Amino acid sequence: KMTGIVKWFNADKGFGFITPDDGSKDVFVHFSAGSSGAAVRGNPQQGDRVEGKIKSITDFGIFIGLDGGIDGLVHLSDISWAQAE
Amino acid sequence: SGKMTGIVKWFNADKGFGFITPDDGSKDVFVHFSAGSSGAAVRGNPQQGDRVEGKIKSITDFGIFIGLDGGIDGLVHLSDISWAQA
Amino acid sequence: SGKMTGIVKWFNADKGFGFITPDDGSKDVFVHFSAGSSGAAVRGNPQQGDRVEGKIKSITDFGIFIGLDGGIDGLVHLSDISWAQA
Amino acid sequence: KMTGIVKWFNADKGFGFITPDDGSKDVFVHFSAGSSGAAVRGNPQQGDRVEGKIKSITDFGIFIGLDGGIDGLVHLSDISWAQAE
């Protein structure tokens, strides 16, 4: 549960910057802007309340470029293999 | 992308890390997994060069925590976000 | 890649963040910058749709800090690494 | 300055896993394996000393996919524009 205050925001393009009530670190948010049941609200303004739920990224893949660079970061929903012996 | 099949370059199933060559594209993938993606059962490593399959999803909803020094202090899934109405 | 020219979608030069459409490829880019990449001089925003240039480098040498809960707790540049000899 | 101990390592492929002497978080390292002046040392083993220098990633670009996903993370060496007015 993350509660905080808008520093700046671009809801239409799905990103923003928030100061959480807890900890000492601000957060840049990116999200799919769209619909999930309620009518659209105004792009929030500096000082407005914002809430979200966050979860650790414990299951992921990092794609590595031919040059060794960071070429993507995905969620790993599942993985399977046949164990040796 | 959804389904990702490939072959194992290296694996450490005890610690939940692996390195895979996908059958598609030119980029290898490091994986970090828990029981969430791999299941509860204790499973030993696959052999290098054997098959491995997964399911992947783009991370579209995320937070980057920014440190006092301005660095990347954390990367999280943003499960839901809401704000006050104007 | 080196040189990256593009056009501004949105910008916040006061806080060191921006969003750019590169002239090359199909992917937009969010940038986070300090005086290290942007210079000391106070500069106001460019206009939306104007040109912007940068220089980029792949991050090949890095550390991912893993939290007690197994998450991504930090991402850093690894400037040098060494280990004991066998 | 980061000092720590090898948990596992693959020097030839340029990655590893370290427990730093400081803090409560382990670190997965990726690096370009190659030459920078000295002769090659053995892949380190569990319990071996490892050292490195780390720096915050303060100047970066994140590439966003057509689907909104994380499609790359680069270092931003510089950036320039003509300020409006």
Listed by number, the residues of chain C in 7-26 with a beta carbon closer than 8 Å to a beta carbon of chain D are 8, 11, 13, 18, 20, 26
Q: Does D63 touch chain C (CB under 8 A)?
A: yes
Query: Resolution limit in angstroms?
Result: 1.9
Read out DSSP for C39-71? -SS--PPPPTT-EEEEEEEE--SEEEEE-TTSS
- Strand (E) or helix (H) holding B35: helix B35-38
Contact between B72 and A28 under an 8 Å Cβ cutoff? The reply is: no
CATH class of the domain at C56-86: special
| Residue D23, min C-alpha distance to chain B (Å) | 14
Structure tokens at D40: 């090659």
Contact in structure between B37 and B86 (CB atoms under 8 Å): no
Q: Do A51 and B79 touch (CB under 8 A)?
A: no
Q: Which residue of D has its CA nearest to C26?
A: D66
Copy the structure tokens of residue C9: 């979608």
Residue labelled with tokens 């921006």: C18
Residues B49, A14 contacting (CB under 8 angstroms): no
Q: Search chain D and give the residue with CA nearest B63.
A: D70
Contact B59, A75 (CB under 8 A): yes
- Among D8, D56, D65, whose Cβ lies nearest the Cβ of B71? D56
Superfamily of domain B1-55: Nucleic acid-binding proteins (2.40.50.140)
CATH tag for D1-53 (out of 2.40.50.140, 3.40.50.300, 3.30.565.10, 2.40.10.10): 2.40.50.140
Q: What kind of experiment solved this structure?
A: X-ray
Sign of the Cα pseudo-torsion (A34, A35, A40, A44, in order): negative
CA distance C30 to C15: 13
* CA D32 distance to own-chain centroid: 9
Residue A11 is given by DSSP the state G
Closest CA to D77 of A64, C4, C20: C4
User: CATH assignment of A54-85, given 3.30.1370.60, 6.20.370.20, 3.40.50.720, 3.20.20.70?
Assistant: 6.20.370.20
From the list C16, C66, C74, which residue is nearest B72 (CB)? C74
**Would you call D73 and A70 a contact, using CB atoms and an 8 Å cutoff?**
yes
